[PDB]
Design a protein around this ligand. Structure first.
Ligand SMILES: CC(=O)O[C@H]1C(=O)[C@@]2(C)[C@H]([C@H](OC(=O)c3ccccc3)[C@]3(O)C[C@H](OC(=O)[C@H](O)[C@@H](NC(=O)c4ccccc4)c4ccccc4)C(C)=C1C3(C)C)[C@]1(OC(C)=O)CO[C@@H]1C[C@@H]2O
Ligand SMILES: Nc1nc2c(ncn2[C@@H]2O[C@H](COP(=O)(O)OP(=O)(O)OP(=O)(O)O)[C@@H](O)[C@H]2O)c(=O)[nH]1
Ligand SMILES: Nc1ncnc2c1ncn2[C@@H]1O[C@H](COP(=O)(O)OP(=O)(O)NP(=O)(O)O)[C@@H](O)[C@H]1O
Ligand SMILES: Nc1nc2c(ncn2[C@@H]2O[C@H](COP(=O)(O)OP(=O)(O)O)[C@@H](O)[C@H]2O)c(=O)[nH]1
Ligand SMILES: [Mg+2]
Ligand SMILES: [Mg+2]
Lengths: 329, 412, 426
């Protein structure tokens, strides 16, 4: 039993990733709250089943990448869409999973690995395929699309394609033909990302990030152009306004962005599981990633979570996201 | 000895002006006499202004009248977090400035309207900030929880499942008076299809007078505020008893007024007279505080109650032998000169915790889900400094309030 | 609190004259005179629509935007026309061409900055701003295009203050213009994405409601306008009055919009009886809900009976029993459980002012958010395609610096908007 309830199989679920504690904090104040059972249940308070998969505080970056992104990259190279969503609050491990360190042989994230696998097929399988890897990097800040390359545009617009599906026109794209140029785009975009001035350790994301890898491949013999889009969406942080006390800072401004986008989130998995079509074209995020939210099921949601007095908040929301589907039999 | 009061939300303020009226009325202190002992909060000026323009205009200090010219918003979030926040400090200041001036107080009788913006949200953090600044006192909040079918706001439940969960871990005893179930009383026990809000207010304005006013007033069987929560709450959940009044007879129509105790007390347990659509559909009482006032012989009571204790169809909880706090005052009630209240020489304002609300909460919780189930007006709160957390996590909250009010009863 | 009206285009303008014709009397403000107010209550809250300068001159705080002089020069050369401070008149002597594109990208885009300028002078007036009222017609240049721009800018300048929009959606039966669906589809687009409360009125839903619900045989425009202005007074201004249970733009907004689209409503007035005879006074209350909730009497074109409701706001304004009000609303909610959507236990938002419309005993504005309005954007959207397909009078747009993808955009958008709205009718 329990399998028939997997009606959600929509895969569009959200794999849980717990980050481990470092020795400096095991006895500072932060202690385990995550009890793991098997390799797919996490007991936090009252909770008898979780969902599809829980990655423990012993799961490698490589291991997270295999389950979550490796298939999505494979499908993208055949001309399909895929989405990888990322979520988790401050000190949950987001920076460590998506990029990690830019050149680290096994501590590197998702984006440097995809970049390595892309250029390992290129020049080994190009004899009729002419590849152009185009990267685009933009943020949604105050629900306006701010391009993060070239000259920062404080707003940027969508237009519609041949099928009447929207896409971000004018988004500055650039060629990348080796891994280095991809890193240089990341360094450029992060240096203008809206980050709250906390202590140096904390990285409080107030702007949601969309990293586009557009795998354009051209075929030389009469067959035409393919264009797989991999949307790597780094969600900005969620912070419990009640506790922190936003009087007036980019706390209030972030609270409105993170809540509007997480709410649209809720409807999108619920629709991706079973509903009639609904809140598309509501926000710019939704306008950027729509074609993926309807077809090639590859919108892996990778939510982080670190034991402690904190992170329990954003972890909880990450679990509440794809928890309902078929109930039951 | 005293008990401050914070009337929050237009409603809590209308009811406030009312309860505040009945007061001087039975204390011989006309328009301009002494000095109140409460405050008024609202994020919509025009309403507190009514206390600044209308009657009982100069009986207050423009200092105990807090307003936020800004916006009310019939949404918890905004009133609690975002906007409501800005005012709170200032608000507190008075309940700390008015709390100091006195002499060994007992608590703050809070007046709010569960399903509002300024009433649900705001207070939520007002009572919140109190439970910490004066944990060592009484926090009896007098609420006007959501009409069972005749609600107003479209969101109401969002605002009331949220004022309950945030205040729950902060109140001492929460009195409840159902707006609709009071209308019935105005239709069935007074006859009038013309009940202005100004009436329901005169009513609670009565039942309330029986709580503080007269009780804090000498008598043959005094009952302190603490007394309540002690003799009234079996468990830490800021338990919510129900308010009921006895001689709710019409001062025009019928006239049997002279309705000796033996009668007015029986008239409290019949469900059609309790300012709450929580008809004892099964809810076993677990403690009642029969506050009497006027000419009453203790034996009359210690008999009229005895007769009741043995009606059985009035089934009291198991774990409770005797749950009847008999509060006797002297001075009879005091009806508005010419409203529509009979004016007897004795009354029974009995309040109690009844496993009955197992219902009322249920029916109000369910509401919530239906909408949350579709997020309905969710974007209105999120965009106001709230999250999927506060809702879902305040739903789970009440869930254990449906189990609580179930376990403490129905079982032996 | 406060608000700043906006008279975009001629229509939106013509109506301005009627909205202010009324409102003033509902506030005792003579042409340039002051507050003659029969009472003293029609003053403690005026601010919402005026400003203090002289001491007898409370000037309406609205904006008059239009690219056709003659118009504003008819509104400024007639009755109350001499109460607006000239600074308010943001004219565009250019050719006010009937092109959405001519008043949104080419001609209007210039006059915009000289507008925003004032919309800021008025916003930064004093106290605290609530939102802006916007009148116009979605079937012309200065209306749909330039007015639809005015907001897209307003909503970037104060994404906090609200935005009520009073649109005269293109009446069905007969279109008082030809490209209508062009100027329309293009403006609704802008609406569904900036203003957060829209009250759609139909010149022919009015006629009807004005020729059969008012035996009125010669319903001049002035009238229609007058009727409309009657509703927008019940909405705003009204709630800025006391009440057993009062609300205000937000309450109205925060109780009426379940989903961010912005959604459009359909206003309905209460006592709508013919002069002499009819003066039946059957206005105890069941008579007002009788009214408000019937098909006819909905300023919209579509009929509620053709689609559930999401929210309803009976904004009454006249001494009544919070019992006979709160009660009625219920039976109403049960006699028609069929159409009233279920996932909202209490769709209705009862509101209750005190003072009524100057000369009347009891009234009640109705602001319905029914799914029925699906069957209107459908209409509009249809007309588009049937003519877009052949690019009918498209050269007047493109030739004005437009895009073949712009029209595509709007239709789709507004077209999807139809879709969604059905997601609840079911
Ligand atoms: C002797 C008497 O009682 O006369 C009434 C009257 O006969 C009736 C027929 C009025 C009359 O209204 C109309 O005939 C009408 C004309 C064009 C468009 C719409 C309506 C009246 O003109 C309208 C007028 O309305 C008001 O005074 C309100 O305050 C109203 N004011 C205006 O619309 C207004 C008109 C001119 C100049 C300035 C303002 C209002 C309503 C809502 C919000 C704000 C203001 C009233 C009660 C009457 C007359 C004078 C005959 C009615 O309308 C209103 C809006 O009240 C029509 O059905 C109602 C029922 C009324 O009993
Ligand atoms: N008994 C009684 N109930 C009232 C009175 N006024 C309002 N109510 C009820 O309380 C609720 C109304 O709350 P509102 O007046 O909308 O709001 P508020 O709580 O004052 O605060 P805001 O939403 O910010 O204006 C409804 O359920 C009314 O039925 C009153 O004078 N007496
Ligand atoms: N698996 C891991 N191994 C070693 N260090 C890690 C690991 N995961 C996270 N960290 C470190 O712990 C901190 C959390 O990093 P990141 O900086 O990854 O957090 P978020 O990105 O979780 N934070 P925030 O963006 O503020 O909401 C950083 O100092 C990381 O270098
Ligand atoms: N109710 C109403 N509609 C009007 C008025 N004037 C024009 N209209 C309507 O507006 C449409 C024409 O647009 P118009 O206002 O001339 O556009 P613009 O002046 O170029 O912005 C037609 O559908 C008319 O019925 C008016 O005073 N009242
Ligand atoms: Mg991070
Ligand atoms: Mg109020």
């Amino acid at each position: 039993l329990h399998n028939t309830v997997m009606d959600l199989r929509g895969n569009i679920k959200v794999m849980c990733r717990f980050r481990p504690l470092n020795e400096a904090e095991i006895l500072r104040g932060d202690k385990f709250i995550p009890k793991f059972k098997g390799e797919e249940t996490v007991v936090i308070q009252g909770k008898p089943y979780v969902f599809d998969r829980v990655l423990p505080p012993n799961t490698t970056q490589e291991q997270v990448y295999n389950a979550c992104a490796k298939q999505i990259v494979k499908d993208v190279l055949e001309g399909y869409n895929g989405t990888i969503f990322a979520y988790g609050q401050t000190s949950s491990g987001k920076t460590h999973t998506m990029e990690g360190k830019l050149h680290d042989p096994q501590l590197m994230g998702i984006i440097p690995r995809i970049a390595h696998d892309i250029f390992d097929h290129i020049y080994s399988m190009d004899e009729n395929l002419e590849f152009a890897i185009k990267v685009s990097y933009f943020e949604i800040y105050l629900d306006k699309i701010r391009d993060l390359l070239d000259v920062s545009k404080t707003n940027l617009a969508v237009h519609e394609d041949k099928n009447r599906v929207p896409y971000v026109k004018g988004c500055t794209e650039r060629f990348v033909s080796s891994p280095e140029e991809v890193m240089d785009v990341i360094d450029e975009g992060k240096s203008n990302r809206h980050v709250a001035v906390t202590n140096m350790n904390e990285h409080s994301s107030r702007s949601h990030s969309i990293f586009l890898i557009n795998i354009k491949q051209e075929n030389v013999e009469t067959e035409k152009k393919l264009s797989g889009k991999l949307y790597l969406v780094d969600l900005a942080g969620s912070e419990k306004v009640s506790k922190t006390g936003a009087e007036g800072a980019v706390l209030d401004e972030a609270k409105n962005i993170n809540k509007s986008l997480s709410a649209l989130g809720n409807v999108i998995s619920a629709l991706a599981e079973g509903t009639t079509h609904v809140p598309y074209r509501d926000s710019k995020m939704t306008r950027i990633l729509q074609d993926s939210l309807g077809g090639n099921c590859r919108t892996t949601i990778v939510i982080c979570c670190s034991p402690s007095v904190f992170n329990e908040a954003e972890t909880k929301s990450t679990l509440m996201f794809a928890a309902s589907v078929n109930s039951c039999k | 000895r005293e008990c401050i009061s914070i009337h929050v939300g237009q409603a809590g303020v209308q009811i406030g002006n009312a309860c505040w009226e009945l007061y001087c009325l039975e204390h011989g202190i006309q328009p301009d006499g002494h000095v109140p002992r409460a405050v008024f909060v609202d994020l919509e000026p025009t309403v507190i202004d009514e206390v600044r323009t209308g009657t009982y205009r100069q009986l207050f200090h423009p200092e105990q009248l807090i307003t936020g010219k800004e916006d009310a918003a019939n949404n918890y979030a905004r009133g609690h977090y975002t906007i409501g926040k800005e005012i709170i400090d200032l608000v507190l200041d008075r309940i700390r400035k008015l709390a100091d001036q006195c002499t060994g107080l007992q608590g703050f009788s809070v007046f709010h309207s569960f399903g509002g913006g300024t009433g649900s949200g705001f207070t939520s953090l007002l009572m919140e900030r109190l439970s910490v600044d004066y944990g060592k006192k009484s926090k009896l909040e007098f609420s006007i929880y959501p009409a069972p079918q005749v609600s107003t706001a479209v969101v109401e439940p969002y605002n009331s499942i949220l004022t309950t969960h945030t205040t729950l871990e902060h109140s001492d005893c929460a009195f409840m008076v159902d707006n609709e179930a009071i209308y019935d009383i105005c239709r069935r026990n007074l006859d009038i299809e013309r009940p202005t809000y100004t009436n329901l207010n005169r009513l609670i304005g009565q039942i309330v007078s029986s709580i503080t006013a007269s009780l804090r007033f000498d008598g043959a069987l005094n009952v302190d505020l603490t007394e309540f929560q002690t003799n009234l709450v079996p468990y830490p959940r800021g338990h919510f008893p129900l308010a009921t009044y006895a001689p709710v007879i019409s001062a025009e129509k019928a006239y049997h007024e002279q309705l000796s105790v033996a009668e007015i007390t029986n008239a409290c347990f019949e469900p059609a007279n309790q300012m709450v659509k929580c008809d004892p559909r099964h809810g076993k009482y677990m403690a009642c505080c029969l506050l009497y006032r006027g000419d009453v012989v203790p034996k009359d009571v210690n008999a009229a109650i005895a007769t009741i204790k043995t009606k059985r169809t009035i089934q009291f909880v198991d774990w409770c032998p005797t749950g009847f706090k008999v509060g006797i005052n002297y001075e009879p009630p005091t009806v508005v000169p010419g409203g529509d209240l009979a004016k007897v020489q004795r009354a029974v304002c009995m309040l109690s915790n009844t496993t009955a609300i197992a219902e009322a909460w249920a029916r109000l919780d369910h509401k919530f889900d239906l909408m949350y189930a579709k997020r309905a007006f969710v974007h209105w709160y999120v965009g106001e400094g709230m999250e999927e957390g506060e809702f879902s996590e305040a739903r789970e909250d009440m869930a254990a309030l449906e189990k609580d009010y179930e376990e403490v009863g129905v079982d032996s | 609190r406060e608000i700043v009206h906006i008279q975009a285009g001629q229509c939106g303008n013509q109506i301005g004259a009627k909205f202010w014709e009324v409102i003033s009397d509902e506030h005792g403000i003579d042409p340039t005179g002051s507050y003659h107010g029969d009472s003293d209550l029609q003053l403690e809250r005026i601010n919402v629509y005026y400003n203090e300068a002289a001491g007898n001159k409370y000037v309406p705080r609205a904006i008059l935007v239009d690219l056709e002089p003659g118009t504003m020069d008819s509104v400024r050369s007639g009755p109350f026309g001499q109460i607006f401070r000239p600074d308010n008149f943001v004219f565009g002597q250019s050719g006010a061409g009937n092109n959405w594109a001519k008043g949104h990208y080419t001609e209007g885009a210039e006059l915009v900055d000289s507008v925003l300028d004032v919309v800021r002078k008025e916003s930064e007036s004093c106290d605290c701003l609530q939102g802006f009222q916007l009148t116009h017609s979605l079937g012309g240049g200065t209306g749909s295009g330039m007015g639809t721009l005015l907001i897209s800018k307003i909503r970037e300048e104060y994404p906090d203050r609200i935005m009520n929009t009073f649109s005269v959606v293109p009446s069905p039966k007969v279109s008082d213009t030809v490209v209508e669906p062009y100027n329309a589809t293009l403006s609704v687009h802008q609406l569904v994405e900036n203003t957060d409360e829209t009250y759609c009125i139909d010149n022919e839903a009015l006629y009807d409601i004005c020729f059969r619900t008012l035996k009125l045989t010669t319903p001049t425009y002035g009238d229609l306008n007058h009727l409309v202005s009657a509703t927008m007074s019940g909405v705003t201004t009204c709630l800025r009055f006391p009440g057993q249970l009062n609300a205000d733009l937000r309450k109205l907004a925060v109780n009426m919009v379940p989903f961010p689209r912005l959604h459009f409503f359909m206003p309905g007035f209460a006592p709508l009886t013919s002069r002499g005879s009819q003066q039946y006074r059957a206005l105890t209350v069941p008579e007002l809900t009788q009214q408000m909730f019937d098909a006819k009497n909905m300023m919209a074109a579509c009929d509620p009976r053709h689609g559930r409701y999401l929210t309803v706001a009976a904004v009454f304004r006249g001494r009544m029993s919070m019992k006979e009000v709160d009660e009625q609303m219920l039976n109403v909610q049960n006699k028609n459980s069929s159409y009233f959507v279920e996932w909202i236990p209490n769709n209705v938002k009862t509101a209750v002012c005190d003072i009524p419309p100057r000369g009347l005993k009891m009234s009640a504005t109705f602001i319905g958010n029914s799914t029925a309005i699906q069957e209107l954007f459908k209409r509009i959207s249809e007309q588009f395609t049937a003519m877009f397909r052949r690019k009918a009078f498209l050269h007047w747009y493109t030739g004005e610096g437009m895009d073949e993808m712009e029209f595509t955009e709007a239709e789709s958008n507004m077209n999807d908007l139809v879709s969604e709205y059905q997601q609840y009718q079911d």
